[PDB]
Enzyme design. Structure first.
Site, PDB file in Angstrom:
ATOM      1  N   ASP A   6      26.308 105.265  33.810  1.00 27.05           N
ATOM      2  CA  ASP A   6      27.155 104.103  33.954  1.00 27.05           C
ATOM      3  C   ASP A   6      28.286 104.102  32.942  1.00 27.05           C
ATOM      4  OD1 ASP A   6      28.192 101.789  34.314  1.00 27.05           O
ATOM      5  OD2 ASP A   6      26.298 100.666  34.120  1.00 27.05           O
ATOM      6  N   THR A   7      29.484 104.549  33.376  1.00 30.46           N
ATOM      7  CA  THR A   7      30.606 104.643  32.458  1.00 30.46           C
ATOM      8  C   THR A   7      31.121 103.276  32.061  1.00 30.46           C
ATOM      9  OG1 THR A   7      32.122 104.798  34.353  1.00 30.46           O
ATOM     10  CG2 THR A   7      31.347 106.888  33.404  1.00 30.46           C
ATOM     11  N   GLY A   8      30.707 102.205  32.774  1.00 36.92           N
ATOM     12  CA  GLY A   8      31.072 100.848  32.356  1.00 36.92           C
ATOM     13  C   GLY A   8      30.109 100.234  31.336  1.00 36.92           C
TER      14      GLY A   8
END
Ligand SMILES: CC(C)CN(C[C@@H](O)[C@H](Cc1ccccc1)NC(=O)O[C@H]1CO[C@H]2OCC(F)(F)[C@H]21)S(=O)(=O)c1ccc(N)cc1
Ligand SMILES: [Cl-]
Ligand SMILES: [Cl-]
Ligand SMILES: [Cl-]
Ligand SMILES: [Cl-]
Ligand code: NA
Ligand SMILES: [Y+2]
Ligand SMILES: [Y+2]
Lengths: 99, 99
Positions: free
Chosen positions: B25-27
């Site tokens: 999850d790059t967020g």
């Protein structure tokens, strides 16, 4: 571009004619912005995350200029703490993770 | 590996000896699991997202086997709807976004 992840992966977009920054978010199914105005009919919805569901409006037309591409995508609008670009939009521009 | 984003980007990990599935999850700034037990002292925290703040415990040791690597990282434990691998862990394995 290719980016590492030492900082939050923000990109500059133009959504429905409005300039915004948004988080490239591989954990988001759905692109969401706060504080934009879009024309036409919408359909109501909710999104769930860490600590709660939120209430959003869905728009199915909406232009999104991102990373040199222009796609037509679904945009949810509602009071998210940051704007995010989800997999619906990222798949349209062929984004990949390398790990 | 290189992956596209047509499906949720789950990976299999071993965290503190327990096998789990977690979303790349790059967020997410930091890695979070639910339903793991970890030894030793922890420190209190909350994270915020769509919907508000999940309450968590932070652990600073904690081994994480991911993508053929063994990291030692910070792990938050609390009732997240899906386990996520955040940028804290992804940077240690050299992950990149291409778009
Ligand atoms: C919103 C973002 C800035 C922060 N979050 C990470 C997201 O990737 C989160 C990760 C996440 C995934 C699945 C469940 C909960 C959280 N996804 C998310 O909220 O997506 C929503 C929008 O599209 C839908 O797809 C997943 C969804 F949640 F339903 C909806 S987070 O989960 O709140 C989060 C915040 C801090 C840390 N350290 C770790 C995670
Ligand atoms: Cl940052
Ligand atoms: Cl507002
Ligand atoms: Cl999926
Ligand atoms: Cl696939
Ligand atoms: Na889209
Ligand atoms: Y606002
Ligand atoms: Y549980």
């Amino acid at each position: 571009p290719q980016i590492t992840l030492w900082k939050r992966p923000f990109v500059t977009v133009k959504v429905g004619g409005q300039l915004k920054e948004a988080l490239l978010d591989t954990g988001a199914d759905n692109t969401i912005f706060e504080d934009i105005n879009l024309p036409g009919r919408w359909k109501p919805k909710m999104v769930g995350g860490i600590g709660g569901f939120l209430k959003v409006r869905e728009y199915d037309q909406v232009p999104i200029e991102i990373a040199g591409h222009k796609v037509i995508g679904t945009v949810l609008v509602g009071p998210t703490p940051v704007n995010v670009i989800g997999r619906d939009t990222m798949t349209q521009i062929g984004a990949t993770l390398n790990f």
